């Protein structure tokens, strides 16, 4: 059965998809993401699919033009978190540990700037908790080297300007404050702005066409078509889009007894907005009938590691069982691990078996201007299409689904 897939997976087709999409970054809600949506829609149509485009709005964020952070007089290096409000405050700096509801409680922060350490709770909770006590601004310092780049999740007027700084420059301030030093700081954020944008999900569905063998099962194969600012996103995630499109083309040449939904989600980098919006469109019957959701994200980099399957809870499910079965016949042992950070999380949330297929550890070009076409491996793209396609086909081919018992290890 695998041969029906493996003899049809065209690596050149996938390479070409990536070439077209990665000519420029595809920031969610931008003209470039719209261009990708149109392109993807047209390719699905070319394979004979009826296509639907689901629109949705979300709050976008334009990084601030001026990020000035100063400790008394010396100018420091800091980066405002996404969705950070604007500010022009100069006041005493107060250390509030991790910034929990208790840490900031027993401390006078009214009109002051809070110094918080990165820990477990979200950057959003810290800013929010500090702002609740009167803090006019928040300075968060990293736990490791390198600049601290984070996001407050989404817009929220309850926030106050928030900027991040490296661990070294943070432990120093915290130490002096604990030592009893009275420090004054300056936090000025200008340029930041939030506006409503529209993104889209592209859905191509192949209804079962066997006949008496048709089941009422549904399988979703997805990827996301947006990329981060300044990143051409060849591997993240044009690669996933490419495999999604090619597998749709491959399946159009075969009879199936399972409904297949090939989807490219928008605004994945903004917090899985697209997939959340699509998941929310499903009926209770559709949810119970979806036997598995396969997410393809970063599956073609010559500089990435081996293929692995990630689940939200780090447990095996129907999708990892199918992935492992296919791989066992085609390439060898395919491990699984625990990780979210992609659209499969939106389906796992509904109780639908889901897994992310990705090459880990990821390449160093991840989310950089270096995530380009010349880093792509046709051989790897073809391998992923072969494995994911055969895993899906094990279920979609006419006849009852049978998954033989096979062992595969969990790997972190
Ligand atoms: Zn192959
Ligand atoms: Zn092939
Ligand atoms: Zn639209
Ligand atoms: Zn991605
Ligand atoms: Zn990404
Ligand atoms: Zn080779």
Phi, psi (5° rounding) for residue 306?
A: -75, 160
Backbone dihedral angles phi then psi of residue 115, each to the nearest 5 degrees: -105, 115
How big is the chain, counted in residues?
A: 412
HEC profile for 145-156? CCCCCCECCCCC
Residue 386 is assigned to a ligand binding site: yes
145 is in an annotated binding site: no
CA of residue 244 to ligand 1 center, whole Å: 15
Name the 3-class secondary structure at 186. Answer: strand
Task: Please state the φ and ψ torsions of residue 376, each to the nearest 5 degrees.
Answer: -80, 135
Report the C-alpha gap between 248 and 232 in whole angstroms.
24
- Rounded distance between C-alpha atoms, residue 112 and residue 93, angstroms: 6
Nearest CA-CA partner of 263 in 227, 308, 218: 218
Strand partners, 358: 308
CATH 3.50.30.30 correct for 65-191? yes
Query: Is 3 among the annotated ligand-binding positions?
Result: no
CB 357 within 8 A of CB 373: no
Task: Say how many Å lie between the CA of residue 379 and the centre of ligand 6.
Answer: 6
From the list 301, 304, 295, 303, the residue with the least C-alpha distance to 391 is: 295
Do 161 and 85 meet the contact criterion of CB atoms below 8 Å apart?
A: yes
Residue 105 CA to residue 326 CA, distance in Å, equals 54
> Which ligand sits closest to the CA of 34?
3
Find out whether 52 is annotated in a ligand binding site. Answer: no
Phi then psi for 102, rounded to 5 degrees? Answer: -95, -40
CB neighbour class for 388 (10 Å; exposed up to 12, middle 13-18, buried from 19): buried
The segment(s) of the chain belonging to CATH 3.50.30.30 are 65-191
- Centre of ligand 3 to C-alpha 34, Å, is 8
Residue with token string 């059965």: 1
Q: Do 356 and 298 form a contact (C-beta atoms < 8 A)?
A: no
* Spacing, Cα 139 to ligand 2 middle (Å): 51
367 marked ligand binding residue? yes
287 burial class (0-12, 13-18, 19+ CB within 10 angstroms)? middle
Strand 218-224 relative to strand 290-296: parallel, antiparallel, unpaired?
Answer: parallel
CA distance 345 to 347: 5
User: What is the location of CATH 3.40.630.10 in the chain?
Assistant: 1-64+192-412
Is 339 labelled as part of a ligand binding site? no
Q: Is 200 annotated as a binding residue?
A: yes
Cα 318 to averaged position of ligand 2 atoms, centre (Å): 24
Query: What are the CA-CA distances from residue 155 to residues 87, 90, 162 (Å)?
Result: 15, 24, 13
Q: Ligand 2 center to residue 7 CA distance, Å?
A: 6
Structure tokens at 377: 């491996």
- Resolution of the experimentally solved model in angstroms: 1.8
Sheet arrangement for strand 79-80: 74-76, 66-71, 184-190, 87-95, 113-117, 137-141, 161-165, 79-80
Burial of 405 (0-12, 13-18, 19+ CB in 10 A): exposed
> 304 with 360: CB under 8 angstroms?
yes
Q: Confirm whether residue 269 is marked as ligand binding.
A: yes
* Rounded CA separation 142/121 (Å): 13
Class of residue 351 by CB neighbours under 10 A (exposed 0-12, middle 13-18, buried 19+): exposed
Tell which residue, 23, 95, 17, 74, has the closest CA to residue 296: 17
Starting from the CA of residue 33, give the closest ligand.
3
**Residues lying with their CB under 5 A of ligand 2, a single-atom ion:** 9, 382
What CATH superfamily classification does 1-64+192-412 receive?
Zn peptidases (3.40.630.10)
Partnered with residue 113 across adjacent β-strands are 93, 137
């Amino acid at each position: 059965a695998d041969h029906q897939i493996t003899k049809r997976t065209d690596a050149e087709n996938m390479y070409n998809t990536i070439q077209f999409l990665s000519q420029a970054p595809r920031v969610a809600g931008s003209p470039e993401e719209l261009k990708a949506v149109r392109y993807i829609e047209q390719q699905f149509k070319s394979y004979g699919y009826h296509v639907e485009v689901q629109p949705f709005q979300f709050e976008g964020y334009t990084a601030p033009s001026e990020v000035t952070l100063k400790i008394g007089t010396e100018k420091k290096e800091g980066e405002a978190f996404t969705y950070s409000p604007n500010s022009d405050v100069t006041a005493e700096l107060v250390y509030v540990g991790l910034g929990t509801t208790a840490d900031v409680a027993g401390k006078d922060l009214n009109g002051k700037i809070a110094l918080i350490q990165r820990g477990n709770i979200s950057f959003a909770d810290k800013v929010r908790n500090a702002a609740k006590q009167g803090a006019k601004a928040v300075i968060i310092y990293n736990n490791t080297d390198g600049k601290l780049n984070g996001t407050l999740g989404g817009s929220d007027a309850s926030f106050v300007a928030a900027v991040g700084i490296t661990k070294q420059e943070g432990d120093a301030l915290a130490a002096n404050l604990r030592a009893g030093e009275k420090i004054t700081a300056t936090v000025k954020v200008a340029g930041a702005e939030v506006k409503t944008l529209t993104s889209h999900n592209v859905i191509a569905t192949k209804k079962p066409d066997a006949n008496k063998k048709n089941t009422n099962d549904i399988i979703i194969i997805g990827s996301h078509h947006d990329s981060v600012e300044k990143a051409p996103g060849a591997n993240d995630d044009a690669s996933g889009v490419a495999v999604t499109l090619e597998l749709a083309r491959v399946m159009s040449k075969l009879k199936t007894d399972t409904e297949l939904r090939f989807i490219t989600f928008g605004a994945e980098e903004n917090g899985l907005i697209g997939s959340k919006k699509y998941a929310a469109s499903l009926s209770e019957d559709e949810i119970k009938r979806t036997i598995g959701m396969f997410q393809l994200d970063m599956v073609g980099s010559k500089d990435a590691g081996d293929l692995i399957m990630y689940t939200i809870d780090g447990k095996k499910n129907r999708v990892t069982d199918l992935g492992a079965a296919a791989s066992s016949r085609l390439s060898g042992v395919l491990p699984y691990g625990q990780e979210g950070r992609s659209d499969h999380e939106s389906f796992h949330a509904l109780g639908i078996p889901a897994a992310l297929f990705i090459h880990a550890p990821v390449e160093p070009w991840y989310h950089t201007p270096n995530d380009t076409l010349d880093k792509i491996s046709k051989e790897k793209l073809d391998n992923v299409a072969d494995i994911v396609g055969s895993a899906v086909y094990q279920a979609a081919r006419p006849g009852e689904l049978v998954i033989e018992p096979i062992d595969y290890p969990r790997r972190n």
